[PDB]
Every structure is written in structure tokens, then in C-alpha cells.
Amino acid sequence: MSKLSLIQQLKQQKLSVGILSANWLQLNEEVTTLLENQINVLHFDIADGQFSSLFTVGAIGIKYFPTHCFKDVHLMVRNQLEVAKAVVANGANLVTLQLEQYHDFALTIEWLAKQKTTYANQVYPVLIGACLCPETPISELEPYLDQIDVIQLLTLDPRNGTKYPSELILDRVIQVEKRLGNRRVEKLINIDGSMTLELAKYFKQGTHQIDWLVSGSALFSGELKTNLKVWKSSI
């Protein structure tokens, strides 16, 4: 199966859930609740305290989640190649790098391009993502746009904790869409960073196609089931 076929299938899903935002003693039930609600995309922030102060989990974090879940693995690390190998080895289906981490960006996307993993009950190439912090110019994507599958836009800069204006983020979505042209159908444009129902509604009211929004602590502030009912009702 090709990347393109997979990408079109994924667009059926609207939420990449940051599952480790849950209580780690309730992970099985949380994932069960997600599956019961036709959600199977799980986001992981793999962060080493080197890109930002953010020091979260390594590859081990993604390991025990079922292979019938799509593992959207977001790296914010110093050693992107090494960490990419580790997450691919633990079943990552998408590996997203930080564009700002330029020292091994190209090398890592080169290695990723040759990897395959299994999703659901089939073998696919691993999807490759590029994430940009809010001030990183969309213009810096140009050398890689053809090669990447996912463009992820952060709402905030983890390197300072600063949350950026939602209108800026929507503008950036437009700038990305423009550059993709007729190849827009070949990519996911996703938004990540301290997602709230208010941001979610603003981005989806925005008349420009966003594929996935990534959930954070807000989904798990209160019962997941409750919050899912709102997501499903409101957005």
C-alpha cells in the first residue's frame, strides 16, 4: 500500500489524541473509550529536554499501544536520527521532526523515507512530518515539501511556552495550502499545541482544510467520555 492511499484514509479521522495526557494508570480504559468512539489516532510528544525544556518520554512511550492504532509520533529532540530509529522500531506510523532542528533534518528524512511499518493489518511506508513553531517561516519548507507527508503547525513555541495568536496559525495553514497547490490531497496539514475547544472551533470555522487537530491536557480535564461528547457535538 502506498503513502497516498494511507493519507487519504487518515483524513477520515479528525483528532490525533495525545494519549499520555491521560492518567497513566488508566491508559487501557482511555484507549478503549477512544476506539469505542471511532478514534484510533494517538499522538505522542517525544521530547528530551534539549529542543525545549519539555522532557516527556522516549520511544518506550508508544510501545505498548495496539498496532490497530495509528501512532503519530512527534519528536522534539536533539538527536533526531537516533530517536527516529527508536520510535520506528517501536512501531511509529508517522514520525514528525522539528524543521528548526536543521542539523540532522535532511539526514533523518532520508532514513525515514526507506522505512515501513505495519498499521492495522497492512504494511505501509512510515509517514514523514515537519513541524514548525509559530515564528518559523513557511518559506523554510520549500526544500522538503515534496518529500514530507505531514505539515504540522504548532500554536505555541515550546522553547518559551509562548502561545501565539490563532489568526496567525490559520494564516500559516493558508500559506502552506497555497504552496501545496494541486498536491494538497497528498498531505496532512495538522495543528498541535495546547488545543482547547475554543481554538478547535476557530480553526474549523476557518474555511481552510485542517486534517487533524492534536489533543492535549484539555481532553483529559474532566472525564474523557464527557469531553468526547462535546467534541463530537461542538466540532
Added chain:
Amino acid sequence: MSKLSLIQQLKQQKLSVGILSANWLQLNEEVTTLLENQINVLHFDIADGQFSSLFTVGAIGIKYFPTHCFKDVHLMVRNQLEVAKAVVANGANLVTLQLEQYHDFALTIEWLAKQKTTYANQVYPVLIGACLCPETPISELEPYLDQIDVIQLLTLDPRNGTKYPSELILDRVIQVEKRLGNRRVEKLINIDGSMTLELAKYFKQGTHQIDWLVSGSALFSGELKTNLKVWKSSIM
């Protein structure tokens, strides 16, 4: 209870369980099983991919475990001071530093020495550990022996692919013991790294008191309940 009395009580346990070696979707069942078995010491390897290539989990890893468990938090990181603050905030009861992290070791134990935490329903000082990779000279511990509570010896170096004979680790326990003298009673001397039943039997094969063995993947290779039955019948 003082720090010393806590240390004596802690010595009643023989195993510090590497809980995140479990299947993460089963963490609650696994913690329940340990508690049912009179085991409540949980070991966490907080590793940032910088001290070595080992990159496990940050402070969030300890957060959701019950405060009635004793959290034995082993740092293998570049910025020890910063991580120590983060793990203490998430309830660390013991913070073990790498002696090889020379740049902030003393500073971090200085900070740790001012900290207090909750174990059971009582406030204690945070216990302080020093961990050595196998090739690090025991003599380098000398300046800190009175400031630390726990000496942890690794059976392996995560920065290496070297296979270190187990006999050398027991030799190192003797080197620590000899330096401590009558202070030994005040400390835990613990062994960590790829622990197996065989290795446990060897280390426990006496003469030289070892307080905790830290468990890893072996404890969760097969059913936890089964492996605990095995551990208790062999060693306990």
C-alpha cells in the same frame, strides 16, 4: 521518624521494582499485585538521551503512581539539578544522581538536602543517592559519603557496550563497605542493571549485605505474579 529511621524501615524491603518495565496498559494491575505482595518500592529510570543514549521518561513518569509507594528515582541525565527539581515536585522519595555528572553533582545534592517529601502520611527528607557505572572509581565517592544515603552500583554502563563481570560488582560493594566503616548501617547499598534471578542469587549469595536489587525487564518477562512467587521462594 527521622531519615535514619526511614532508612531502617526501607531495609525491610529487598526489591526496588522497575515498574515502567511493565506493559504500560497494565500499570494499575501491576502496582496492585506488588502491593498485595508487600512490595511498594518503585524504581524509575529518568534518562534524557544525553548522559547516554538511554532515553526513557521524564518526571511525568512518576506522577501517577500512588503516594503510598516509595518512589526511587534514578537520574541518568545531563541537567541533574533541573530534573531533580521536577521529580521532587512529582513526589520522588529518593533521587539518585550519576557520580559521572561531575558538573552539577555537588550542587544538586546541596539542593536535595533541603527537600522534604511525603511517604505514607509523614514528612521525611528526600533521600539522596549516588550511582556509579562500573569503571568509575569507588574512591570518587569519598567526598560525598556523609551527604548521601544510597550508593547504587550499576552492573552495566549505558554509555558502553561492555560486558562487565558480575564478580567486579560484588568487589565494588566491598570497596564501598570498606570506606563507609561503621557508617554502613546508615546507608543503602543497591545494585541496578539487567537484573535476573541468577544474578540476584549471586549477589544475595551473601557475606556482603546488599539492601535493594533493582528489577527490570526480567520481572515482567512472563506473569508478574509468577515471577514474584519465584523471587520470594528463592531469595526471601
